[PDB]
Amino acid sequence: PIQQLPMMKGMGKDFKNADYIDYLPVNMLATPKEILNSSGYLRSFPGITKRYDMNGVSRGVEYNTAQNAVYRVCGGKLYKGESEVGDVAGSGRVSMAHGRTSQAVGVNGQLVEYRYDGTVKTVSNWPADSGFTQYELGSVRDITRLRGRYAWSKDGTDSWFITDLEDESHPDRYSAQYRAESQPDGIIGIGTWRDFIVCFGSSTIEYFSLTGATTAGAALYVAQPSLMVQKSIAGTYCKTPFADSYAFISHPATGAPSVYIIGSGQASPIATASIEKIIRSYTAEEMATGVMETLRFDSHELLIIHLPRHVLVYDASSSQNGPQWCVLKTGLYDDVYRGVDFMYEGNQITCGDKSEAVVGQLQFDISSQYDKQQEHLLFTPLFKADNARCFDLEVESSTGVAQYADRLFLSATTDGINYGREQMIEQNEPFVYDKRVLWKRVGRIRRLIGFKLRVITKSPVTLSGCQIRLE
């Protein structure tokens, strides 16, 4: 009875809570392609190779459409591609919003614009003798641009502003004060959807659109109640565009945080039970600092979440049978993925680094990160077979490019938490394209069994449909 075993999502227990939890694939990306005898094949995450150096760790990335180049802020130094243009203070993550006449990076509570001719100007009220309206700008939290205006939100308050059209440094001449007052929620973050300025609060997601008013003093932006979403973003950087909309993490005010996507003025969950348990395992401050972003390559639509001790990835194209999450990791133990702030420029993707002061470009023919080994895990779900025997355990691997015949550690559990002996089987052979990863004499399943496929390699691993001859 040749019986196939799915590998896109693994099952197991949780030794603390005794709850069944999803054992997620690690450093793998399920690809829904009809391969051989299976409907999909697991593909290792692309490796990272150092393109060139940078000052400090990466703090933000944004593809400047106006200049057709990517502006990246690493450490305390602003970079445009390879070259070094600006100087940026601060040490935490920074939000950027490119403009046609200036590239800006909201840092240290002030919106700093790096003009394209070299000069630097900071947002401040109009001069008192000018005669235009004077506001209380306060501290800048998040920024965005729409129709030639920079929109930023005062820190710790639900008010957000817009800059003037003529002089972008100062805010608007007469009408530059706007409030997301539909609820008593402060604006955790701001952004631009189509032609709408979102105002992501702490219990609501309000929208805004231009009213086209001409008379001085009239509110340029008017609320759109019909599009309101009754959820929120947990932290300032827990939002990102994804599939022509913003996904985010629910603020603890509305309940337990859970990854959401905004649709037609309504939030639909895309986080399984295990994902939200992992998210809830964090405290408020730790999970607030998480940053989440979108990466798109080949056919996958990744939605990468950079939590302090986990890096969850949502693959939209591989969600045919349900949400598909893979936990990326760096190093042999449970360290956090180093790659951060992915952006696609020119021909190949480039990513920053959380620890080192470098920038890495994704390379698809290797899985090593900065010339280091990496660990790929694959867990099959627990299935109940009583007094049965299993002999043939074959996984289809795309043997090919490699440096050594990196063997995989294949182990099987019996209670779904702790595993047995680690058996080593050759997975790739360098320069050989027809090797089969076959193991015989698996043994007797007393009640439950679950196989963990573990590969340590510097070359891509492509595992396909797993069949077991449960005789």
Place this chain on the structure above:
Amino acid sequence: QIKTKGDLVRAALRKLGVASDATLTDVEPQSMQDAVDDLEAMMAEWYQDGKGIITGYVFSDDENPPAEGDDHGLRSSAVSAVFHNLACRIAPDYALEATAKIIATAKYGKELLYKQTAISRAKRAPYPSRMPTGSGNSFANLNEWHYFPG
């Protein structure tokens, strides 16, 4: 090689395919011990003190509590019989049954075990008490005449 009652047991379970080395799941040592117990019971049943099949087996004892470690002491040729036998005995233990090849090999092994003893136990009985020695024998002159059995 296979020199311990445990080895015969772990060699059997292997022949069934339950826990065979190179195996991802192995059976608990409790089942190994009690399968050693089953081996001992089967060999005691075979041996029947003097009369039954004589395999050269050595039984466990209290000075050696781990019966598995004890050297079985079987003849070098006899290890294949108790090997392929005793596999059918633990076959229903996991509700598995033994393949026809194992059944045939166990039958052949037991036949080979008993062949030498059966040849050694022919021993035609002596002449009965009434059979007389003929005049040909010189012992007739010694007054023996009729034979003496027993």
Place this chain on the structure above:
Amino acid sequence: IKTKGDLVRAALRKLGVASDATLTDVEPQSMQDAVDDLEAMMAEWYQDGKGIITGYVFSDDENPPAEGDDHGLRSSAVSAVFHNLACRIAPDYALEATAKIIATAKYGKELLYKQTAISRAKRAPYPSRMPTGSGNSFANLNEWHYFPG
């Protein structure tokens, strides 16, 4: 091995009902039930001495807390007895013992009765009417015809 509980646990193992290989712990009700069944089977076999004899001892289960403890069974008969007990308690759980268990029980019962059958073969003495031949000492000692019975 050397107690009724071990014999009955071996039988339950052979059924696969309760064993460490199955991760089932013997039910105390099952324990008492199959021990009572073993008592009945051994009594039926023993048949008050005229039938097969194995050395088994019938506790009494009147003064002790339970009948199942210790057994005078010969070391060679343990396999036969617990296989037969397993076969007899098979329909209790609606299971049916595998053909190997049945064959083993038949073989074990045959081996148990082999020695008793050889011992009981004996031979009847000569009939009361059969005389001794002239070539005997009892011919002079007036015995002549053989002693009856």
Place this chain on the structure above:
Amino acid sequence: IKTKGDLVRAALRKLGVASDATLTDVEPQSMQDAVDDLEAMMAEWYQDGKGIITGYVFSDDENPPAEGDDHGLRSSAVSAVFHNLACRIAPDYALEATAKIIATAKYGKELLYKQTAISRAKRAPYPSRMPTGSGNSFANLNEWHYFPG
């Protein structure tokens, strides 16, 4: 051919477990295990000299790193030995050897024992009570009745 490793790798090939025709490389555990099974089978066949004899030499697997290396088996018996080994190790992987393998093993064992059976046929010497005829020299040399045994 000329080593235990080749014989065992030959058996696995016929069974279909591991061969170049199948793109499977023999697992070292499988190699050692089936070599042990071959040792047991040859010991059973040899039967301490009274049974079938092939010229096989039992290494010892005590001083060497592993028992499987070299074999004194006759060149004509390699086919029979490795087919029989494949048949014996068939149930290890839950496979069953194809009927051709079983027939080949039967044929090979028969051919192995043919010559030994012809050699062992012999004929028992004349019984101790059978005498020479009057037409012999031993009649004059007083031998007369044939030598017993």
Place this chain on the structure above:
Amino acid sequence: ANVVVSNPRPIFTESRSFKAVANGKIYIGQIDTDPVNPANQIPVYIENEDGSHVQITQPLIINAAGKIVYNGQLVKIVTVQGHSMAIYDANGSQVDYIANVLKYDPDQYSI
């Protein structure tokens, strides 16, 4: 330089004969206390490959090769520092009653 490559999985043999204690039982408890009593039993941890520590029932099992075996196969048992031991064979006898394992270190001057 200062770490020895040694037998990683410990070997528990029997006192009266050179054989592994099949179905042996090891109980781990407080210093200079009987570890059979569940009260005296101290935490005992498996260290699977993921670096986790999952705690298991105190009567750890010993296979026919002398190693410690969980429900399935070989594991790397871990305790804190001051663990007592008491080997019991399946028959129920006693083999060891090692009071303080830390008092068995080949160099007790460092302690």
Place this chain on the structure above:
Amino acid sequence: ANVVVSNPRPIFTESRSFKAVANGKIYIGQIDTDPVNPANQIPVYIENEDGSHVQITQPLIINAAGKIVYNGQLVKIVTVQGHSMAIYDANGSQVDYIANVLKYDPDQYSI
């Protein structure tokens, strides 16, 4: 009590039977990795009686008694830091695999 007697030269056996690994091989390597790749290999030294550390060829050899031997005589092998071992028997099958082990030498406390 200052020094307790304890045997050096730790013994290696199989995983399911008490037989000792005969002419096997022990490979040392980084934490939680395949210790067969020279990329993953870690240097291991010989600590003689005089204390003179000397490097050894990587694949360790086991005599018929489950003890490391180099140039015939038994030797004590010491690694630089934590390591993962993959014990191979004579044929090439795995006796066992372990990801993380640590046993600091009790000797050379003066140093």
Place this chain on the structure above:
Amino acid sequence: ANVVVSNPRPIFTESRSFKAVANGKIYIGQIDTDPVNPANQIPVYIENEDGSHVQITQPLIINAAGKIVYNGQLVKIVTVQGHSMAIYDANGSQVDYIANVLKYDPDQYSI
């Protein structure tokens, strides 16, 4: 959860084969000397579970399993100073010899 469960009792096995040194002998001597000589034999102590150090006769005795035995019971053998173990089999042979077990004499090093 720091240390790994390991058998502390020392089992003495022959160097060239996997057998116990049945009814063997262990002689404890001075540093870098031959313990066979009666003069080069330091006083040697047993440590009981309660911790009552007691002296015994030097030519130690080994049971059939390898463990040291005094009066038919397992004992822990300690010395007040660094020694040089010398193990001999029952037949009589230098199966093993260690010049300095700890590589330093704790007594003198205690200063």
